[PDB]
Each structure stands twice: as structure tokens, then as C-alpha cells.
Amino acid sequence: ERDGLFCARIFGPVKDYECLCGKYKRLKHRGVICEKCGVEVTQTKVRRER
Amino acid sequence: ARYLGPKLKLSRREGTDLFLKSGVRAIDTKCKIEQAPGQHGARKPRLSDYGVQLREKQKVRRIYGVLERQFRNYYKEAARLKGNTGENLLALLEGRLDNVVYRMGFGATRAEARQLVSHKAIMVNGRVVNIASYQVSPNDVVSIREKAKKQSRVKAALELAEQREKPTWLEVDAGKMEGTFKRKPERSDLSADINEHLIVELYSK
Amino acid sequence: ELQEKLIAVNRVSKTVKGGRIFSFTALTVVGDGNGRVGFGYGKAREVPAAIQKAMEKARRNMINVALNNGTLQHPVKGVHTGSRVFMQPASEGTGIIAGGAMRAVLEVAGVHNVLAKAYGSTNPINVVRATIDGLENMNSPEMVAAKRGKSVEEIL
RNA sequence: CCCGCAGAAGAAGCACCGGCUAACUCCGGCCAGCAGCCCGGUAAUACGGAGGGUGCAAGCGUUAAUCGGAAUUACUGGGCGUAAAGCGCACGCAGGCGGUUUGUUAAGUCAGAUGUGAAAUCCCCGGGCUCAACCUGGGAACUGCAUCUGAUACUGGCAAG
RNA sequence: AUGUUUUUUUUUUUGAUUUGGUGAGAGG
DNA sequence: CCCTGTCTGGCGTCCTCTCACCCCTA
DNA sequence: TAGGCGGTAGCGTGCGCCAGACAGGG
């Protein structure tokens, strides 16, 4: 739930390179962040450090 | 002069979410966004070069809710102007009054914003502008007039926007219900998925 | 990282005592979105195998091209057998103005902005070859400076 | 032009879906029919109807006509052994082109200026009709012609080699 | 000596290593 | 201010194995 | 399908040492 304790737009995506909206599942044409949920399609290891 | 039919059908045909519905409810719930419209939806063969260009053009067109002659007009204008053509065309499309409104968050959809514009709700620099295709110019303030200020649909649109990401090239006030179009947007500020260069090529046949 | 486009596929026949044996030719081209480009022309009894071969061949014998940022460095002509090709550098935003096989090779090459006409034959195979030739012969400013014993600013 | 009234109210069709060419299925016998070029003889994505789609939209199609694509008369920009294309062979007037050096001229050529090249149209920056079309201020352009003043590498003229 | 003498049936493509705690039992 | 009592904070072996249990009531 | 003694009070009660600060008595 946005934006409670477990979040997605504070702490990052749950899955690897898969945003919460569903826009992007790539890593070749990466770097670009999401617009719907605004979740930077990156890695889930970043939920261990944010 | 407008597309009055099903909206999600267009989205399905394009493949992507075109934001033709407000965004309270997710698109996947409302429709089979992956599957193309009609009896022969599940079948999906690789398109042609011309065809992909055409689809891209359609996507953009559908996003903004313009019709073909008008786009051709926009494109020729962009070509005339200095600088990158596709970028120019995108800027032109953005400058449309109804799109501007939608970005503000006074219309849930772009269609809603267009309707507002038509119904003498919006003012540009304190003068009521009715044309959705009206190209808004830098440092132009654009506001809701006092009559239309009481509408519930406006505040709902504003809330939806607040959920949505805010554009940098604008500055809007939710209490005053007026926003300043500070500058014409940069290509970076816009969505990356749009392949302007295909559009350009399409008309450079 | 490499992108690959099958330009064309064509059925070709061989007459034998029994009848006609059919086969398929696949013309593909591959590139890394930078200078480097390579075409392959494969043949097999079935289509997918032939395109696989085309990809394999293209992947080897690639060729480098000196790109000024998104476009070319100067107008260049290239020919092969019937297909005679003109292509001209163009301003950012214009896109690839080119027809058919030629287009494809340009895209994989990572040129984004060209004005380009194929005179003469438009036989995909020959025209792509001609394109490749025009791209190869095209030299850069630094290259010409080196050739001529000068600095880049001298040449401008 | 502005204000007030009511109520989704009065307001969407045309072409196409074999490939070129975006869009596919079912039902009806080389007939009936289609067709721009390249289907139909009983499982037609090509005829007709339906459903579904695609593209345009107060328009949509067809026909006619022009340029384009056509580098398919090729100045830019094609060719001629076999694809169309070398006169059967020569001489030779007109015509076209013309080794090398110096001098001179300044016709061609180039540079600058002046005069003109109507306005409108086109293009650039602006302004005004709510926007646009439209109207409109200023510029640029009108690639030219004529003159005057220079330059003299090249081409030409004249004079000597 | 002779053959333009019965015209007819098949183009392109979807997924490989996975999972927690507090307490009573119990081997040195 | 100089003791002297009270108070509340710290700490109290290692490794392994097994088992149950992990809201019901309004 | 939805929330933190359960009650018109009282539950706690079987470790022990050391130590250092906070304060009581004089």
C-alpha cells in the first residue's frame, strides 16, 4: 500500500527489473523510471538499502 | 470531428496504455489490454515496416485525440520550424490547450479536459478560450473560471493528477485552480516510448 | 546488444528429373547501432533454417563505418552490379529517408538521419551490398587529415 | 460579442480488409460477379451477404486532369560488343573544340556600387480576429537586365614568339 | 518429311538454481 | 560534604535434534 | 469480516553478584 511501511515508490520494486505498473520488464533499454507507479525499474536488492 | 467510440479498444489495438481512461481502476482489470480487439485478437503476426510506422502514428494521434488532417497540419508546421522535427511536433501537440489542462489535472482524461475547454470552463490569461487546439504560449496562465470552479469533477481530476506524476514544464495551484505554462517541454520531459521518428518517416514517404 | 533484421526471403527453384526442388534464400543484416554492420545471405530447404544461416553469416565478416554523431560525414555513392545508391547526411530529426533493403541496413548501422535514394536496380541483395560499399568507402575528417598530413582544423 | 433557460437533449457516415496495402472469419459454383496491376469450375480471407476489423470523417468514395514516383529524353542525371542504339567507308564547307611562351586588351568571367526587377503571392520575424484558416507591419527574395568603377587566373580578341 | 498441336494444381517465425521464529523434550 | 544505604542497571556455556503453536468473539 | 490487561479490580510472589550512581543521615 502506497505509501505505508512496505512501499514501492519509497523503497523500490518487489520484483527484479519489473516495475509495479507493468510498463517495463527490461534491463537492456533500462535507466528510464516508470510514470504510472513511478517505480524506477531496477533491482530488488535496492529494497535492502533504501 | 471526434472519436466517440470505445477507448480501451484503441488502447488494445495499440498495445500500450494510452491513458484514455481516468486511472482510478487499472487498465488490465477493465479490458484484455494484451489482446487485440475483435474476433481475431489472439493471433498476432509480425507487422510490416509501413505498418509499424502507421501504428506509431495512430498511437500518438489517439493519445492526444486529434484527427488526421490536423496532425498533418501539426507535422507540416513542425517541419517548417527550426530544430528537430519530431520534437517540434511533440511540443506542438503538448501545447494544445486541452492537453495542457489535462496535465494540470483539471480533467481526469484528456477527453474530459477537451470537454471542459469546449464548455467555456477554461480561461487563458483571463480570457475564455474555447478551442481545444489552442496553442498555449510560455508564461501563459490558464485557469478555471469562477462558474466552473464549483464542479466536483474538477477536484476529482486534480486528485487523480496528484496521484500521477507532476510535469516539470508547468506549475499548477490546486487551491487557486490556475497553472502557468512556464515553457514548452523538452523531449526528455515527455514519454520515451513514443517513436516520433517513425511518424516523421511516415509522412516523409 | 546486436540488432538483426531479415530484409527479405525468397523462394528459388532447381529443376530435376522428377520436378522442381524448392528452397529459400534469406537476406539479413546485423549491426550494433554503431559503425559496425554486416549482411548475410543464407539458403536452405526450409525458411527458418535459411534465416538462421543468414544471421550466422552476417555475424561474421562485419564492417566498421565512421559515423559523425547520428548521420554521415558527407554525401556518398555506392554501387553493386545494378543497384546504384546515393545517400546524404542530414540534420537531426529528419530520420532515415530511404527505401527498402537500404533502409534496413542503415537502421542497424545506427545512422538515424539520412536522405537516400536507390537509383538503378533495387534488387535487395545488390542494393544492400551497394549500401555497405558506400558506407565502407566513406572516410572521416580525422582519417582524411591523417591521409593528407594535416590537422583537423586545417581541413575544417 | 456577452448573459440567462432547459435538457444528453437535435447531430455519423463513406471506403476498404488476396499481395502491393492498414485491416479475417462464417454463410451463399469459370455461373452470377470482381478488377488499378498480378480471383470464381462445391471447403473462395479476391464474387454477394453477415459478424468482426482497418482507414478517413461531415465528409467518404469513383471518374477526369497535372506533376511525382519515372535517373522512363537522364542540364543537374542514362545509354549504344550480345538487351533499343556506331552512318558501309572516306573527304570536307558551316559549326564545335584547340599545343606552348611573352605582351596587351578586358568581350566572356569575377568583385563592388547604382538604377530597376509593380503590388499581391512564396519564405523569415512580428501583430490582429477566442484559435485557425483569414487579415496584416517590417524584412528577405524576385536567381534577371542595364550602367559605372575595379580584378586579369582562365576562355576569347589583337601583336610577337 | 514434320512439330510452341490440348493449355491445370504448395514462400516467414514464443520458458533453465528458490523459503521463518519463541518456548518443553534430547546426544556429548 | 562525607559517609552509607538503596536502587537499578548489567551479566549468567556450546553445538545439534525433536515436537506443538502462531486469534476467537462480536 | 474486523482489533490489542478486562474491567465497573488486580494480576505480580522460587536468582544472584557486582558496581556505580543517586540519595539519606548526620
Q: What is the DSSP string of C19-67?
A: SEEEEEEEEEEEE-SSS-EEEEEEEESSHHHHHHHHHHHHHSS-B----
CB B52 within 8 A of CB B183: no
Strand residue runs (E) in B42-174: 122-124, 127-128, 140-144, 170-173
- Buried-exposed string C45-74: b where 16+ CB fall within 10 A, e elsewhere: eeeeebbbbbbebbeeebeebebeebbbbe
Report how far residue C27's alpha carbon sits from residue C8's, in angstroms, rounded to the nearest whole number.
5
Identify the sign of the CA torsion B12, B15, B18, B19: positive
* Residue of A36, A37, A40, A41 to mutate, interface with B, max B Cβ within 10 Å: A36
**A interface residues, B as partner, C-beta within 8 Å:** 22, 32, 35-36, 38
Cβ contact C47 with chain E strand, < 7 A: yes
Exposed/middle/buried for residue B110 (C-beta within 10 Å: 0-12, 13-18, 19+): buried
CATH 3.30.230.10 range(s) for chain C read 64-148
Best probe of the C interface among B77, B197, B199, by most C CBs < 10 A, is: B197
DSSP class of B48: P
- Phi then psi for residue B157, to 5 deg, are -60, -40
Q: What does the block give as the cell for A14? A: 518487489
Q: Is B103 left (phi over 0), alpha (psi -120 to 50) or beta?
A: alpha
Q: What's the Cα-to-Cα distance from B69 to each of B72, B74, B82, rounded to whole Å?
A: 5, 9, 22
**Cβ-nearest to B84 among C92, C96, C103:** C92
Rounded CA separation C31/C33 (Å): 6
- The CA distance from B140 to B126, in Å, is 10
Q: Please, what sign has the CA dihedral across residues A19, A24, A25, A31?
A: negative
B28/A36 Cβ within 8 A:
no
CA C137 to chain centre: 12
Cβ of B85 within 8 Å of Cβ of C97? The answer is no
d(CA B69, CA B195) in angstroms, rounded, equals 20
| Cβ–Cβ < 8 Å for B146, B59 | no
Q: What is the DSSP string of C101-156?
A: HHHHHHHHHT---EEEEEEE---HHHHHHHHHHHHHH---HHHHHHHHT--HHHH-
Question: What fold does the segment set C3-63 form as a domain?
Answer: Double Stranded RNA Binding Domain (3.30.160)
Closest nucleotide (CA of B36 to C1')? D53
C-alpha torsion A17→A18→A24→A30, nearest 10:
-10
Residue B159's alpha-carbon distances to B18, B40, B106, in angstroms, are: 20, 38, 9
**Contact status, residue A38 vs residue A32, Cβ threshold 8 Å:** no
Closest CA to C4 of C53, C77, C58: C58
Q: Is the peptide bond before B140 cis (omega within 30 degrees of 0)?
A: no
| Distance from the Cα of residue C2 to its chain's centroid | 15
DSSP state of A48: G
Strand E contact at CB of residue C20, distance < 7 A? no
DSSP secondary structure, B177-197, as one string = TEEEE-SPPPGGGS-SS--HH
- Burial grade of B196 (CB within 10 A; 0-12, 13-18, 19 or more): buried
Every domain of chain B and the residues it spans? 7-93+190-204, 94-180
Q: Does B191 touch chain A (CB under 8 A)?
A: yes
Give domain B94-180's CATH architecture.
Answer: Roll (3.10)
The gap between C16 CA and E2 C1' (Å) is 29
Spatial CB neighbours of C66, under 8 Å, sequence gap ≥ 6? C35, C73, C138, C139, C140, C143
Question: Closest-CA residue in chain A for B165?
Answer: A35
Under 8 Å CB-to-CB from B203, ≥6 apart: which residues?
B72, B75
Closest CA to B143 of B108, B109, B171, B115: B171
Cell numbers standing for residue C88? 546524404
Q: What is the rounded distance in angstroms from the CA atom of residue B95 to the CA atom of residue C95? A: 23
Cβ atoms of residues C3 and C29 within 8 Å: no
User: Which residues have a Cβ under 8 Å from the Cβ of B104 and sit 6 or more positions away?
Assistant: B142, B161, B170, B172, B179
Which experimental approach was used here?
A: cryo-EM
How many Å apart are CA A21 and CA B198, to the nearest integer? 26
Fold held by C64-148 = Ribosomal Protein S5; domain 2 (3.30.230)
What is B131-150 written as a DSSP string? -TT-B--TTEEEEE-TGGGG
Tell me which chain C residues have a C-beta less than 8 angstroms from the C-beta of B86: 93, 95
* CATH 3.30.160.20 domain extents, chain C: 3-63
Question: Hey, which chains touch A, using 3+ CB pairs under 8 Å?
Answer: B
Query: Is C118 an 8 Å CB contact of chain B?
Result: no
Nucleotide D8 C1' to residue B119 CA (A): 14
In strand D, the nucleotides that come within 7 Å of a protein beta carbon are 2-4, 12, 20-25, 51-58, 70-71, 123-125, 130-131
Q: Please check whether the domain covering B7-93+190-204 is classified as CATH 2.60.40.650.
A: no
Cβ(B142)–Cβ(B105) below 8 Å? no
* DSSP H or E run through C14: strand C3-15
- CA torsion angle A35 A38 A40 A41 (round to 10): -70
Does B94 contact chain C (CB < 8 Å)? no
Q: What is the DSSP pairing of strand C96-97 with strand C114-120?
A: parallel
Dihedrals phi, psi of B76, to nearest 5 degrees: -65, -40
Q: Which chain E positions have some atom within 7 A of a protein CB? A: 11-14
C-beta atoms of C93 and B201 within 8 A: no
Distance CA B41, CA B56 (A): 19
Residue with grid cell 516539470, as numbered in its chain: B168
B95 and B133 Cβ atoms separated by less than 8 Å = no
Is A36 close to B17, i.e. CB distance below 8 A? yes
Judged by a CB distance cut-off of 8 A, whether residue C112 touches chain B is yes
Interior angle at CA B57, CA B53 and CA B60, nearest 5: 140
| C48: CB within 7 A of chain E nucleic strand | yes
CA distances, C51 to each of B47, B81, C42, C106, C129 (Å): 18, 43, 6, 19, 18
Helix (H, G, I), strand (E, B) or coil at C82: coil
Task: Give the C-alpha separation, C77 to C100, whole Å.
Answer: 17
